[PDB]
């Protein structure tokens, strides 16, 4: 049903009601709707320059960049030199631009997590750990394996029954789909040392993870591992269309391809207003409101656990009646989501107050009754 | 190569200080050139109200585009506009392959589409890419694709007819912009909708280059009063936002079953592109066609409104390119006796002028 107006975690439909987002458009407005540092952004360079082809720079895309370098490479300024990014305009055309590094490696095989979710281009959609969105568009473009999201296992005796045909692992250090799955303690260092040994590139998809959404800047940071290459787009809009393939290394050298809004300078505006508000403190402010989330649920009925970090956070029931909560959860003021009929998923602006969390819990507290 | 800082009309301005005339537009997606008043309104208004919007909502912006790109296929056709519907996306890329994915849909593994095509570098649009050397670096490909040489009839019919009940879908673009300018045959996209209507198979116009009336008529394939089970369009119709969209009429809308503020801009370009506004850029379209007839190196002057490609005496398109930076034109090779014009489809007379006496000073020696 119809929407029109927001500000901060606030947006309101055509018959005037405010509602507290949780979902944030499933995690693009990190900074909520109509944010200051944004619209200055925006009003300032479309008054100037709309959009340039990659034969020309511009600087908003340059700035952009030198920043994901900055965020990615953690006070290393050799990780950051061999390193680039390239500019999509979307996650799905982001991790395409991965997949081609994949193949670009000349290995066939690239194996990817069972209920991953990648975008549902051709080539992002023969990544995606679901079944059921592939079934309708097969054949796929050939290469792509699956394995269970945490098993080093089974991921193991699966890279080394043929390890020199592995061009890369895809991962998602959180799993969005299906609930808020967090990489297990270990997983992400094994996966670092499994493709250290074979040549593998190590592939991390933060498109949803990515932007301070986890409490660090890119999730894969709270594992104090470095992936060949990190996938990103919503959160790093602020509303707009965006993707980024940042890759370090013999990845970077690989990459052939090229996007027509490649380095988009209004994309790349708003891109430069997020990353401005979004700093390591911003990151610490995500943590805490997080565990203000669990500690706030964790006393509430019918809530068994609440699992995720920062606000990317599957609320547990104990009663299959998430969908349900959804669709009453809109008549109490709050926008939920239901990746399961367990789990109530929360990712909001990550600009949210105390008080909207607080009511927020609220809200959700009442429904379940 | 060079830093562009600001732009207005058919110029854009580098930090060096330099100003040209842009005559490429950012590869044809500037309509309206940059600093458009129309669209920087749009844009200042759709951000202030509202971000992104989940495909989980309604927006109006969304749907209000989506009711006048219907309005703009369906040529005062009630029944035609009843049966079509638009999905929005972020690139031309991105719309090719939920052609892509339509065509898949049939139930179909024969995928048609033209030699020297260009649909996208998405594995999917790539896979429609009739260029091979920016396929191989990615093979395997998604199966299905095969090539027929551009607007050969007697050619396609043949090979549809070796395997006519598994062709799913045949792509096109109503003019071909990659390696040079060529427009379909007198009687081409006739000859494939007649071809696809018996045999059960998808038309699908790609117009991501084609579109907004960049050449003379809002939709290219409308020139030739076809209509398509599927049109991709995308650079154009927003001003300089990333956007893209497929419409599907019929069967083609039955098996399909940020935004905001591209939609915000895409508004803005569909209230400035009229009838009227297509009609100016035909004529700016022959305009170019004369004055350019009357310099030395141009043979032939090929293609449609302000999709243009300037055919050269000598193989000197790669070395004019590079001298039209000082002269104060940005120019593009498709081929080297051929040079692409899409300037923003705002470019005055004058400019035109102003620009022809550019190119034919370039091509001195």
């Known amino acids: 049903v119809e929407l029109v107006s927001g500000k901060g975690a606030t947006v309101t439909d055509d018959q005037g009601n405010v509602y507290i987002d949780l979902l944030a458009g499933i995690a693009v407005n990190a900074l909520g709707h109509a944010h200051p540092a944004i619209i200055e952004a925006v009003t300032n360079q479309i008054g100037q320059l709309g959009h340039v082809s990659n034969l020309f720079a511009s600087r908003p895309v340059v700035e952009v960049a030198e920043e994901l370098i900055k965020r990615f490479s953690l006070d290393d300024a050799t990780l950051a030199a061999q390193t680039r990014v390239f500019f999509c305009n979307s996650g799905a055309?982001?991790?395409?631009?991965?997949?081609?590094?994949?193949?670009?490696?000349?290995?066939?095989?690239?194996?990817?997590?069972?209920?991953?979710?990648?975008?549902?281009?051709?080539?992002?959609?023969?990544?995606?750990?679901?079944?059921?969105?592939?079934?309708?568009?097969?054949?796929?473009?050939?290469?792509?394996?699956?394995?269970?999201?945490?098993?080093?296992?089974?991921?193991?005796?699966?890279?080394?029954?043929?390890?020199?045909?592995?061009?890369?692992?895809?991962?998602?250090?959180?799993?969005?789909?299906?609930?808020?799955?967090?990489?297990?303690?270990?997983?992400?260092?094994?996966?670092?040392?499994?493709?250290?040994?074979?040549?593998?590139?190590?592939?991390?998809?933060?498109?949803?993870?990515?932007?301070?959404?986890?409490?660090?800047?890119?999730?894969?940071?709270?594992?104090?591992?470095?992936?060949?290459?990190?996938?990103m787009a919503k959160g790093l809009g602020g509303g707009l269309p965006i993707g980024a393939c940042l890759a370090t290394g013999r990845a970077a050298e690989l990459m052939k391809h090229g996007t027509t809004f490649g380095g988009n300078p209004v994309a790349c505006a708003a891109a430069k207003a997020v990353l401005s508000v979004v700093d390591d403190a911003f990151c610490a402010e995500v943590a805490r409101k997080g565990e203000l989330f669990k500690?706030?649920?964790?006393?509430?009925?019918?809530?068994?656990?609440?699992?995720?970090?920062?606000?990317?956070?599957?609320?547990?029931?104990?009663?299959?009646?998430?969908?349900?909560?959804?669709?009453?959860?809109?008549?109490?003021?709050?926008?939920?989501?239901?990746?399961?009929d367990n789990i109530i998923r929360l990712t909001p602006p990550l600009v949210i107050t105390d008080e909207e969390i607080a009511d927020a819990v609220k809200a959700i507290a009442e429904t379940i009754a």
Not at 93 to 105: D, G
Not at 173 to 185: L, N
Not at 195 to 214: A, F, H, K, S, W
């Open 93 to 231: 055309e982001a991790n395409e631009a991965a997949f081609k590094i994949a193949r670009l490696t000349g290995r066939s095989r690239i194996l990817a997590a069972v209920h991953g979710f990648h975008g549902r281009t051709m080539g992002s959609l023969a990544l995606t750990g679901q079944p059921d969105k592939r079934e309708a568009f097969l054949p796929m473009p050939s290469g792509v394996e699956f394995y269970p999201y945490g098993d080093t296992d089974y991921l193991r005796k699966m890279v080394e029954t043929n390890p020199t045909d592995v061009a890369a692992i895809f991962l998602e250090p959180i799993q969005g789909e299906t609930g808020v799955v967090p990489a297990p303690e270990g997983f992400l260092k094994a996966v670092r040392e499994l493709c250290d040994e074979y040549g593998i590139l190590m592939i991390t998809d933060e498109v949803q993870t990515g932007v301070g959404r986890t409490g660090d800047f890119f999730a894969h940071q709270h594992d104090g591992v470095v992936p060949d290459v990190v996938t």
């Open 295 to 340: 500690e706030l649920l964790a006393k509430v009925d019918g809530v068994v656990d609440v699992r995720g970090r920062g606000l990317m956070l599957g609320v547990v029931l104990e009663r299959d009646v998430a969908k349900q909560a959804v669709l009453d959860g809109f008549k109490h003021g709050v926008i939920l989501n239901a990746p399961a």
